């Protein structure tokens, strides 16, 4: 069978902690009163919830109400527990209340409001400094949650709220997040296609925090090269082919050999043979002002097939790319 793996950092943080911390199924959830909140407008609507801008009438403060859709109760509890565990953490969205609609008993999470500056307007006005700055704010959020035994598992632009005017960043959507237990075999059907790490695509279940580091690399690549998404796959099998067209097929076979992984036969006719492309080949007139040797060196250290070979959030924070922010 496949070779076992464990995280290089924060490996045993949950083991040495009491069951109360990580046992979300046993955690007691206390539902507040929805009448303290007046719904203003729809903010978004994902595949798991409906999100509304609201006012807490008891202060006149702006909040965000995330109504939750038909899902496994286990998952709802897990999200609540992780949020409560991470509450107060740097650049972690703050869960302010847990409420249930008196009539239909629909669960809803109440968060601090973030004035999310337009994503289509941001992409065009961000400078080399802004990218380094916001990448560092995400790293503070990841180093923190990884240190608390949690992997986000859905790191992407849509899960990152930025109030550019106040230079404030929040990592949101903790619905797919999970407690890291060394040796545990996790579901690979997590994260969004474009940001899925190779481990998920080759069905390698014993993954860890490093999954978030791959997703972060995909975001950085898309930001400095102005190509969204960076790895544009049409499906989960095609997604790996897209990575292979960049990282090459030689290092891919080295990866699956190191962990004794068996490639699904769907890959037989689509993988092909690909040479490793130099990161510099992605530099163009439209993006050259966001690219630097340090950016390329940093990106190269995030986008590795081998999850164990990738920089940790702490190692990433120490990289020369962050000297101008740090
Ligand atoms: O959208 P897909 O079919 O998945 O493929 C995309 C798409 O090009 P095409 O759609 O025309 O093949 C992108 O274009 P947009 O749809 O985003 O306009 C393009 O990037 P650009 O946005 O710069 O055009 C990108 O890469 P490239 O243009 O280098 O082909 C390319 O990816 P694939 O080449 O992997 O299909
Ligand atoms: N704290 C928040 N501040 C501002 N907008 C938010 C906030 N939380 C969620 N949203 C908006 O709602 C969308 C969906 O929220 P999210 O937690 O990511 O739910 P889902 O898991 O269903 O995708 C976001 O992408 C964003 O547009
Ligand atoms: C709908 C919310 N999206 C907002 C958003 C915009 C830009 C980035 C970003 C910033 C710096 C580097 C790479 C990406 C992110 Cl993560 C999220």
Curated annotation (Swiss-Prot):
Catalytic subunit of a constitutively active serine/threonine-protein kinase complex that phosphorylates a large number of substrates containing acidic residues C-terminal to the phosphorylated serine or threonine. Regulates numerous cellular processes, such as cell cycle progression, apoptosis and transcription, as well as viral infection. May act as a regulatory node which integrates and coordinates numerous signals leading to an appropriate cellular response. It comes from Homo sapiens. Residues 34-39 are annotated as: Interaction with beta subunit. The keyword Protein biosynthesis does not apply. It is an enzyme of class 2 (transferase). GO terms for molecular function: ATP binding; Hsp90 protein binding; identical protein binding; kinase activity; protein serine kinase activity; protein serine/threonine kinase activity. This is Casein kinase II subunit alpha. Heterotetramer composed of two catalytic subunits (alpha chain and/or alpha' chain) and two regulatory subunits (beta chains). The tetramer can exist as a combination of 2 alpha/2 beta, 2 alpha'/2 beta or 1 alpha/1 alpha'/2 beta subunits. Also part of a CK2-SPT16-SSRP1 complex composed of SSRP1, SUPT16H, CSNK2A1, CSNK2A2 and CSNK2B, which forms following UV irradiation. Interacts with RNPS1. Interacts with SNAI1. Interacts with PML (isoform PML-12). Interacts with CCAR2. Interacts with HIRIP3. Belongs to the protein kinase superfamily. Ser/Thr protein kinase family. CK2 subfamily. Keywords: Apoptosis, ATP-binding, Biological rhythms, Cell cycle, Disease variant, Intellectual disability, Kinase, Nucleotide-binding, Nucleus, Phosphoprotein, Serine/threonine-protein kinase, Transcription, Transcription regulation, Transferase, Wnt signaling pathway.
